[PDB]
C-alpha cells in the first residue's frame, strides 16, 4: 500500500536538444531520473493515455544537425522503458497535443520552412494515425487544450506573424471555428485547462517573452488576465496536478529557467515550488 502520482518532463532544449525524462513528486519535492528518450527532442509535446506517457514530435538539434520528428513514443512507468509507436504523417516540431477519449491529436508544428495547419489523430487501440480537418490557421508554437471534448488551438506563429487568435475543433462535425482572440499575442505559451477554463501562460509576443497569464471562460466567450508568473517564459512546460497549474522552465530571453511555479486559482497566486535538476526550455510535461 504505497503512493502517489507524478509530473513527467520529457526532452527539451539547453545547449542542444535533450533526452532527459525526469518525474517530479509534488507531495515531497523530489525528482526521479528515468530512462532516456530513444532520440533527443525539443518542442515535442507530452500527454497521457491509459496510464502511459507519450512524447510526440519535436526536433533534434544535435552535433549531427537538425532533424524534425514525426515520431510517437510511449513510456511505461512500470517498466521504465520507452517503445516506438507509428509515426505521424509529417514531422511536427513546436507541436501542440491534446487528448480526447484516448485519442491523441497532434496539431500544427513545423518541418523546415513548412508551417503546418494539418492536424492528425492517433488511435492507440489500433496504432494508426488519421488526418482530420486542417486548422483555419498555420500554427507552430501552438498551445493546445481539451475542454468538454473540444480541442482548442491557441496562439502560435503562422510563418509571418505571431498570433493572438485561437480556434476550436468540433470532433462531431470535424470542423474548426474561430473563437474570441486572446488579449495578448503569444507563441510558445503554455496552455492547459483547469476548472472549466483554458489558461494561456507566458510565451512570446514578437518582441518579449511574457510573464502574463490569461484565461478563457467558455460561457462568457472572454479572456481575462489573472496574476502573472514571477518569471517571464516562452516554451515552458505546463500541466495540471491536484487543482493546480505547474509551469516548468522556459526561456526568458537571457536564461533557460529551472524555475517551476505553481498557480492556485482559489487565491490567484503563483509560487516557486522547486527547480528542475537543470535549466531547459521546450519540454513535454504530463501527469500520471
Ligand atoms: C522560426 C520561428 C519563428 C518564430 C518562433 S516563435 O514562436 O514566434 C518564438 C518563440 N519564442 C521565442 S523566444 C526568443 C528567441 O530568441 N528565439 C529564437 C532566437 C534564435 C533562434 C531561434 C529562436 C526561437 F526558436 F524562436 F526560439 N522566439 C520566437 O521567435 C519560433 C519558435 C520559430
Ligand atoms: C515555441 C518554442 C517552442 C520550443 C522552443 S525550444 O524547444 O525551446 C527550442 C529551442 N531552440 C530552438 S533552436 C536552437 C537554439 O539555438 N536555441 C537557442 C540557443 C541559444 C539561445 C536561445 C535559443 C532559443 F531561443 F531557444 F532558440 N528551437 C526550439 O524549438 C522555443 C525556444 C520556443
From Swiss-Prot:
Compartment(s) of residence: Cytoplasm; Nucleus
Annotated positions for site Sensor for electrophilic agents: 113
Resulting phenotype, residue 251 to A: Loss of interaction with NFE2L2/NRF2. Strongly reduces repression of NFE2L2/NRF2-dependent gene expression. Loss of interaction with PGAM5. Abolishes interaction with SQSTM1/p62
Cysteine pairings via disulfide bonds: none
Effect of residue 201 to V: In a breast cancer sample; somatic mutation
Reported effect, residue 204 to A: Loss of interaction with NFE2L2/NRF2. Strongly reduces repression of NFE2L2/NRF2-dependent gene expression. Abolishes interaction with SQSTM1/p62
Tissues of expression: Broadly expressed, with highest levels in skeletal muscle.
Kelch repeat ranges per the UniProt record: 6-51, 52-102, 103-149, 150-196, 197-243, 244-288
Chain positions found as S-cGMP-cysteine: 113
Superkingdom of the source species: Eukaryota
Effect seen on changing residue 94 to A: Loss of interaction with NFE2L2/NRF2. Abolishes repression of NFE2L2/NRF2-dependent gene expression. Loss of interaction with PGAM5. Does not affect interaction with SQSTM1/p62
Effect in UniProt of substituting residue 109 to C: In a lung adenocarcinoma patient; somatic mutation; strongly reduces interaction with NFE2L2/NRF2 and reduces repression of NFE2L2/NRF2-dependent gene expression
Effect noted on mutating residue 12 to C: In a NSCLC cell line; strongly reduces interaction with NFE2L2/NRF2 and reduces repression of NFE2L2/NRF2-dependent gene expression
Record's comment on post-translational modification: Non-enzymatic covalent modifications of reactive cysteines by electrophile metabolites inactivate the BCR(KEAP1) complex. Accumulation of fumarate promotes the formation of cysteine S-succination (S-(2-succinyl)cysteine), leading to inactivate the BCR(KEAP1) complex and promote NFE2L2/NRF2 nuclear accumulation and activation. Nitric oxide-dependent 8-Nitro-cGMP formation promotes cysteine guanylation (S-cGMP-cysteine), leading to NFE2L2/NRF2 nuclear accumulation and activation.
Consequence of substituting residue 61 to A: Loss of interaction with NFE2L2/NRF2. Strongly reduces repression of NFE2L2/NRF2-dependent gene expression. Impaired interaction with SQSTM1/p62
Subunit description: Component of the BCR(KEAP1) E3 ubiquitin ligase complex, at least composed of 2 molecules of CUL3, 2 molecules of KEAP1, and RBX1. Interacts with NFE2L2/NRF2; the interaction is direct. Forms a ternary complex with NFE2L2/NRF2 and PGAM5. Interacts with (phosphorylated) SQSTM1/p62; the interaction is direct and inactivates the BCR(KEAP1) complex by sequestering it in inclusion bodies, promoting its degradation. Interacts with NFE2L1. Interacts with BPTF and PTMA. Interacts with MAP1LC3B. Interacts indirectly with ENC1. Interacts with SESN1 and SESN2. Interacts with HSP90AA1 and HSP90AB1.
Similarity field: Belongs to the KEAP1 family.
Domain notes: KEAP1 contains reactive cysteine residues that act as sensors for endogenously produced and exogenously encountered small molecules, which react with sulfhydryl groups and modify the cysteine sensors, leading to impair ability of the BCR(KEAP1) complex to ubiquitinate target proteins. The Kelch repeats mediate interaction with NFE2L2/NRF2, BPTF and PGAM5.
Role of this protein: Substrate-specific adapter of a BCR (BTB-CUL3-RBX1) E3 ubiquitin ligase complex that regulates the response to oxidative stress by targeting NFE2L2/NRF2 for ubiquitination. KEAP1 acts as a key sensor of oxidative and electrophilic stress: in normal conditions, the BCR(KEAP1) complex mediates ubiquitination and degradation of NFE2L2/NRF2, a transcription factor regulating expression of many cytoprotective genes.
Name of the featured protein: Kelch-like ECH-associated protein 1
Highest classification ranks of the organism: Eukaryota, Metazoa, Chordata, Craniata, Vertebrata
Amino acid at each position: 500500500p504505497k503512493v502517489g502520482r507524478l509530473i513527467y518532463t520529457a526532452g527539451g532544449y539547453f545547449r542542444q536538444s535533450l533526452s532527459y525524462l525526469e518525474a517530479y513528486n509534488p507531495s515531497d519535492g523530489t525528482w526521479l531520473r528515468l530512462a532516456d528518450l530513444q532520440v533527443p527532442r525539443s518542442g515535442l509535446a507530452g500527454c497521457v493515455v491509459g496510464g502511459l506517457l507519450y512524447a510526440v514530435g519535436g526536433r533534434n538539434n544535435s552535433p549531427d544537425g537538425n532533424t524534425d520528428s514525426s515520431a510517437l513514443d510511449c513510456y511505461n512507468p512500470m517498466t521504465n522503458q520507452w517503445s516506438p509507436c507509428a509515426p505521424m504523417s509529417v514531422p511536427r516540431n513546436r507541436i501542440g497535443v491534446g487528448v480526447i477519449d484516448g485519442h491523441i491529436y497532434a496539431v500544427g508544428g513545423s518541418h523546415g520552412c513548412i508551417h503546418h495547419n494539418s492536424v492528425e489523430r492517433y488511435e492507440p487501440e489500433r496504432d494508426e494515425w488519421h488526418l482530420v480537418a486542417p486548422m483555419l490557421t498555420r500554427r507552430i508554437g501552438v498551445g493546445v487544450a481539451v475542454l468538454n471534448r473540444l480541442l482548442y488551438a491557441v496562439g502560435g506563429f503562422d510563418g509571418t506573424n505571431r498570433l493572438n487568435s485561437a480556434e476550436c475543433y468540433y470532433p462531431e462535425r470535424n470542423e474548426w471555428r474561430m473563437i474570441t482572440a486572446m488579449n495578448t499575442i503569444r507563441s510558445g505559451a503554455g496552455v492547459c485547462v483547469l476548472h472549466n477554463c483554458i489558461y494561456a501562460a507566458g510565451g512570446y509576443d514578437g518582441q518579449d517573452q511574457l510573464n502574463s497569464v490569461e484565461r478563457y471562460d467558455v460561457e462568457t466567450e472572454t479572456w481575462t488576465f489573472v496574476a502573472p508568473m514571477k518569471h517571464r517564459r516562452s516554451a515552458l512546460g505546463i500541466t495540471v496536478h491536484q487543482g493546480r497549474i505547474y509551469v516548468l522552465g522556459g526561456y526568458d530571453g537571457h536564461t533557460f529557467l529551472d524555475s517551476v511555479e505553481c498557480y492556485d486559482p482559489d487565491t490567484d497566486t503563483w509560487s516557486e515550488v522547486t527547480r528542475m535538476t537543470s535549466g531547459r526550455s521546450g519540454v513535454g510535461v504530463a501527469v500520471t
